[model samples]
Target: RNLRDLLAPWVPDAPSRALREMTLDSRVAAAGDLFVAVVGHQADGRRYIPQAIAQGVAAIIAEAKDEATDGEIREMHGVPVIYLSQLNERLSALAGRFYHEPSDNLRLVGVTGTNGKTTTTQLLAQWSQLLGEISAVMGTVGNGLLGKVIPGSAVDVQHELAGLVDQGATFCAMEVSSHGLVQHRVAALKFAASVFTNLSGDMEHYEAAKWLLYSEHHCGQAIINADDEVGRRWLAKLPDAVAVSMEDHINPNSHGRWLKATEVNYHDSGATIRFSSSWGDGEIESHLMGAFNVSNLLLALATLLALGYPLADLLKTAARLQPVSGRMEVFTAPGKPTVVVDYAHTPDALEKALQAARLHCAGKLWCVFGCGGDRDKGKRPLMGAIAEEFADVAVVTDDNPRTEEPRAIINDILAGMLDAGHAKVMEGRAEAVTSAVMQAKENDVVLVAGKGHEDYQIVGNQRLDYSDRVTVARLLGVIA
Candidate 1:
């Protein structure tokens, strides 16, 4: 709790003053706290040293290279300044030291990839908690215990993990984004295990950034999807890493720890997976739909096993591993059609969502989705093609049309459809969900895509009150 304890790990040479708290943001820097000034892509944190010092910070830590000192204690107003050689890269560790290395205090499992990171992290948290450990999660849906999440920021990443530790969470699963990795957001904390899902477009922007992240931060153990080309390359590079596969990519004759599915039976209700790993072998019947989920479950299992949890205990809770809300969450009742809620907004994501839904539907597979406004418009028609190609019925609906003409966005989506008649356009999101649910029969599967757990509809400049889950429940008369 003292400044000495917080800076002990990062800066062994103590400063003149002790820090009572740690913060990157100048606005939050209080008396006796250490204000860290990091250089980001857009704005430099050094610019705010005056603001942090104005708030009566006891000590200042800034990028060593950026700190212009004449070998003297430079003070904005009597605050001690400490320069860190690799401050941007070392920010995570510095925060970890200040926060008492919270990730190490809890069994931390990190899931990374272009996609499935959120779903996979959620599955790990859910499965771990179901097996009796108090678990928490941090990622895209937000950061908190399974159902409760507060959105945004890498600062939220540390705050959430520390909060979970305070709440007595023994285990935590976090989704690590490529941007977060490159920005050194997760560099400080020591992870119990790490899993790489797959890489998509984002990796193309900066070649080899993904590999650099894996090599630099991979600590205790690794669980990799061997089916992914990038994952396979990573596995070859990290020989000690645990290889996980649902598509027979891992060879038993090869090296290191591994988990692979021997067989998977996909049904309308869910999937039954038979798997083998270095830890143990077992069969798991899960209510989560699609082949992708089966892969996610296996990856989580490998991570837990690597962290030293009993294989039998993980297998025991397989059926109890609930599907994450907004990430392929399925809802069905007697005499009613099956409905799925998911956060598949990207073109590749929407394609995978529709294809996954098609595999589970006894009747027609209906996709109801829309693109967000002010985002990359390139994916709109691509998503349209994916929906029309995969789903028997495609309903183009509103999805966060922030400050853009909703009809114009809908037209872009319509451009990719083979036949416009095959797609139905509904500008109102709640009405679109209701209409899709009403059209679906008992055997039909309706996919409510785009916004998953998000509760507000951002139209133009305002966020109107809305929740897809509540709308669906009301339409089905489940809890009206």
Candidate 2:
């Protein structure tokens, strides 16, 4: 279709031209490309209009603020320049139309929350793929088909989903970030189901941003975590929403669509969960560790059930669902302490990581962590306190001390502990991790927190080569 027919619904008077790929960057803009001139905090796309036009762009869609009248179209240098009000908010819808509405063609599930978003999305994609759908995922990790996430903006998201659809993906599980929602990244994408894992972080801004996914977007079915207070409140409002919980949060008397774990037996390997839902009743022999993981699994279970996936099919493939990379990822070797690497940076996350690690530890639980520099210093002491209170051994070390002194970050963490003397102070991250793993007994569990899947460390404007996964795995003589 030409640009005339493409803009017919919104701008009936648009000129005729076949548009190629759309891009926000002028540097990448080319002949036949539609340059999206959006206004951003860091840079204004309108400033690069001449650059885009110089590159022989087919058309230009610029943000209309004080620059031009809303819904106004004009000819510039033999090219049609269109201006639209609130272009950022309208970008997704426009992109969706351009991409032939890929979300509508697939079983798209959006997972949002403080934690478990990644895990929940991974499980959804994995489970749906097991049930014979060509599945994909998009999140903090990246966006791609299963086991192939190679690594966007809203324009990129729609474009990627469209690409996945082109590759024959029938289902996709995406992690919707709070910032992404607030920025209208996922505004126009139709979600077959939206899931709530849990809530944390700053109260008003964070919660409000997360709520936008359910409140403003076309969230087909709300699969919410009833255990979260915010999620429970959302459930109360959305009677049709599926309430999922590992805890006893589902109200038996409400008669709403719900799923809950009747019992979860946590063992050395994983957990055996017996769950009952409105769809049916079944048990899952999950290989993923921890209580929160069980919650994430249940949320995934309820989401698929609400989407009409057979309960028996889900239960059959439950054992094959693996833990996400660097997320409570465990490694063990004969006569070596079990090591767990996780991206738990915040105080709450550290506490949860320690608690989860404690479950598999027959002996002392060792915590080796450090706070990031040039960021929130508030969480330093909080994490220190959590490590001290939760684990038997606290090893404070370096963690991306970018443009800040490593020792200074370590001291700040120690400040949170009741006894600063009780914690072991280490200068380097690798040394700290090695110390914990080598010194601890075979029965002990060591948690190397806050870097997880990241393979680089930012220190003084430099991202040096480093990886917690590789370090931990090598120490245990195992591949990551």
Candidate 3:
């Protein structure tokens, strides 16, 4: 649509110009693109107006700051420069309109919380697809048709959903991050269902934003994890919400619609789950390990069931669902010990990962993990305590030092452990992984935590090529 046509309701007098694409970044701005100049924490998009003009952006929309300018629309180098009183708050709504409201067309399921978003979203997409529907996914993996995606920005989010719709995607499951919520990344997108995963420690950190998704936003149906404390609280508020849980504490008599795992078997390969809900009863031999994964699967199952997919058909396709690439990924060889790679960076996640590893571990369990430099200092010692109590062996190593002294980070981790001798400190992450894998007996299990599917490790200012998957594959002699 023409710029004037698109902004008709907001800026009725906007100059006539065709709009092809829209972005906040100046570097990717192209001819006919609308560059949204927003006021951000680290930098102001307004500073790149000249660069946007150089890149042939057709129009500029800069934040109307009280200190500089009020609401006004002016022409900049023959291109329109629009100033809105609250541009940051308006970005999502503006992008939504420009993208033709893509989220409305597809069955959009938004999964939120500290963990299980990726697995739950992947399950939501994969399960729906098996029932004769084209599905897409968006999250840490990426944004694309299922099995293909990239973690994207708010603008990129709207644009990609539009692209997926064009490619005949009937459904999309997206991971909604806390930062994305607080920053208004998904401000105006309509969701078919909003799934809540369990939160980690310090729920207060993103507590406000999490509640807003239920109350303030356009979350259509609430598919909640009743196993979580906040989920139970949210259930009380959302009487119509579909309660899902591994722990069947939520009263179906009150909620009307609830799904709970009646039985679960956590095996070395995966989990076999039998569940009963208000809808019906079904059993699934899930290829995902851990009780937490059982919870994630149930959330996905309940979400799909709430969407009106038949229970029998869903159960038929349940076995086809695969584990997400990084979370609790298990690798085993003929003679070598089982090794698990997971993205458990937080205290709760680390603890849960250890618990999951322990389930399939026939022999001693080893926890090989490290804290990322320059983030959440309090969790480092807490994680050390978890490893100390849970895993039989704790191997502390480097995990993205990123300008902080690696030794200092290790010392902080050791501070939490009752005995520093329990942990074998190694600065080189690869060496630590190698040491755990080579030393452990055939029956023991080694868990390489923190970095999962990540292919690069940030050290100081440099992002060096690294992959835990590749390192473990080679070390286990599974790859040549």
Candidate 4:
């Protein structure tokens, strides 16, 4: 593609040159590629301009700050340098144009909140596939169609979506993180629907960000959780949004298009939800356990229903939907107690996970959790307090204690607990997970938290090999 034509309207008088690819990182710059150097809070991209030019890039586009004005142009090593005043803010739109606007070609569905984004997005992708459409998912785990995923950045979002389209994907459900929204990762792309899974505490700020997508990007449909307090307020202001809930009453008049669960059965395997919506009434037998999954499933169900999928078809295949790996994933042996591995690092997430674990524990509940080093010291004590009250046994262990002494981190967690004497210290994470599984009785339940799905532990500067699922499985002799 021609560089001048692509940069027109935004950067006129830009030099005419053939472009092969667009990249933000200088390390990946190649011949015929346009390198974008933007000013970021953590590190300035303008510092990498010298390296990018040496990599044989066709042109350079750096953030317009002290270096240059909005329309200023320069030359470095025979390559044209075009500067944009607010490059980082406008990166997504610029990337969109170069990538052929893949979201416009596909039925892009976005899920946003403090949690449940990954599960809701995964459900949307899986549900759409069962309905006979080729689908893809993009979130924390990674991005691609179904099971196959490769990792990358915000530019990677457009790149991967475009790749999925070329591979015949018609629908894509992506998780929209607050950081991504604030950083403009999904700036100008068209979305078929935007879903809200409840944000912890007051999700009001997130509500405005969610609304910003609807207002600025012409977000086609809005699917929200009516059970959330912040969500209920947004429901009143949102004219045609679809509100999904399991606990609250959604007056059809006020909620507009809405869905509410009348009854639910939370079981070991998953949950069976009976619900009524503006469209119709039906039941979904989810293979995902916990109250969190039920809400996420409901949000996905509402989004599909709003997108014109038949209620009967959605109800028929709901049972086959699987749980997202590492999020309340249950592992049980023939004669062993149940073990749940979850990525619940925050205080709110830990509280909810313990509550979810309590649902399936017939006997005593065990919580094996710890906090990261050099991260949020304030939440360390909060998590310890949660385990003390909700768990029958609390195994205080290490979780990626980078740069901080392992004992120092454990002490922070113990500080919050009323009875610090009740908790046991196991410095090694794998050993800690193994201890819980090997010692627990068949009737009890053990929750191995913090490092769920993560296979490595950050110690000082080195990443040590680790996996809670592997440790628990290997100890129980069910490593398959």
lDDT of 3 by residue, 1-480 (tens): 678877877877888989878988899899989998988888999889999998899898888886345447887788889888788777778888888899989899999988889889989999999998899998877788976674555787788889999989999999998778878889888999999897765566465556665466888888988888878888887788998878767695694798988888776567778888999888898888788788888999888889899999999898888778887888878789889999999998898899998988889999999999987789889999999999999999999989899999999999998998879998789999999999999989999999888877889999999999999999887851
lDDT of 1 by residue, 266-349 (tens): 666688899888887899988898988888888888888887779888878888877776777787766788888888888877
User: What TM-score does each of the candidates earn?
Assistant: 0.82, 0.83, 0.76, 0.78
Q: Which stretches of candidate 2 lie over 4 Å from their true place?
A: 39-51, 63-73, 201-216, 332-337, 345-348, 369-385, 395-443, 454-479
CA lDDT, every model vs. true structure: 0.80, 0.89, 0.86, 0.85
> Rank by lDDT, descending?
2, 3, 4, 1
**Highest lDDT model number:** 2
Pairs with steric clashes in candidate 2: none
Query: In candidate 1, where is summed lDDT lowest over 10 consecutive residues?
Result: 66-75
lDDT of 2 by residue, 265-348 (tens): 875557889998888888899888789899999999999999998888899899989889888887878788888888999998
Show model 1 residue runs off by greater than 4 Å: 3-16, 39-54, 66-78, 152-160, 201-215, 343-347, 369-384, 395-416, 422-442, 454-480
Instruction: Return the number of clashes found in candidate 3.
Output: 4
Better of 1 and 3 by TM-score: 1
Q: Score residue 125 of candidate 3 by CA lDDT.
A: 92
Model 3 lDDT, residue 66, Cα = 62
lDDT of 4 by residue, 339-365 (tens): 888888998888889899888778888
Higher-lDDT candidate of 2 and 4: 2
